[PDB]
């Protein structure tokens, strides 16, 4: 109602932002990107 004290988060930028930006892409755009990325990771299938 009025004003006094009380009241109270945040998101992430850069890395989370890059991951999110990858999804606005096309379907096969995401697929080729996934292939290129999986080319590196030794802990993924």
């Amino acid at each position: 109602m009025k004003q006094g004290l009380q009241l109270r988060s945040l998101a992430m930028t850069p890395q989370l932002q890059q991951a999110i930006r990858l999804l606005q892409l096309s379907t096969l755009e995401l697929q080729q990107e996934l292939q290129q990325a999986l080319e590196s990771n030794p802990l993924l299938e």
Partner: protein, 95 residues
């Protein structure tokens, strides 16, 4: 229905997942953990994309069922903010 076959699946190499904790070397474990975190972030990103797409698609198909049924001649004025308000879709991740 989401094209699940056209939906890629991100699998984590479980053999590496079982070959890092036993690593008495800290550098290998740290690199493995960082790779796992990045891969989990990527898989979660793809999954979130798929889920938001499914929700917004349900909203639009509800909105564009007349466009789906009668056709483009009966294609209703459909907008993202209206669709986002109608289906509680993402306010900016959707955009």
């Amino acid at each position: 229905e989401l094209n699940a076959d056209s939906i890629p699946r991100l699998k984590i190499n479980q053999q590496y997942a079982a070959m890092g904790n036993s690593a008495r070397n800290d550098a290998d474990g740290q690199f493995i953990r960082s790779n796992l975190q990045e891969a989990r972030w990527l898989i979660k990103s793809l999954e979130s994309r798929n889920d938001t797409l499914l929700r917004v698609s349900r909203c639009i198909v509800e909105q564009q069922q007349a466009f789906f049924e009668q056709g483009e001649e009966y294609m209703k004025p459909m907008v993202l903010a209206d669709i986002a308000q109608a289906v509680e879709m993402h306010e900016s991740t959707i955009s």
